[PDB]
């Protein structure tokens, strides 16, 4: 019965909020990465190679 949110306006709504939902996810990611010191993900970043090898 979630057919209430299915139409052109809602489709326009979703798009208007995508760059924002996408940028919020970049915030969440880097934020998770930097806070746990994600070895796997971090080692690829040019500077911040404070784990030598």
């Amino acid at each position: 019965m979630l057919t209430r949110f299915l139409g052109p306006r809602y489709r326009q709504l979703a798009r208007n909020w995508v760059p924002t939902a996408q940028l919020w996810g970049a915030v969440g990611a880097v934020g998770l990465v930097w806070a746990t010191d994600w070895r796997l993900i971090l080692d690829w970043v040019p500077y911040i190679n404070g784990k030598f090898k």
């Binding site: 924002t20 940028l23 919020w24 915030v27 880097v30 934020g31 990465v33 930097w34 911040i48």
Partner: peptide, 12 residues
């Protein structure tokens, strides 16, 4: 959005 992304990239 960016404001946050920048301070987080800036915190690192």
């Amino acid at each position: 959005s960016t404001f946050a992304l920048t301070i987080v990239v800036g915190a690192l």
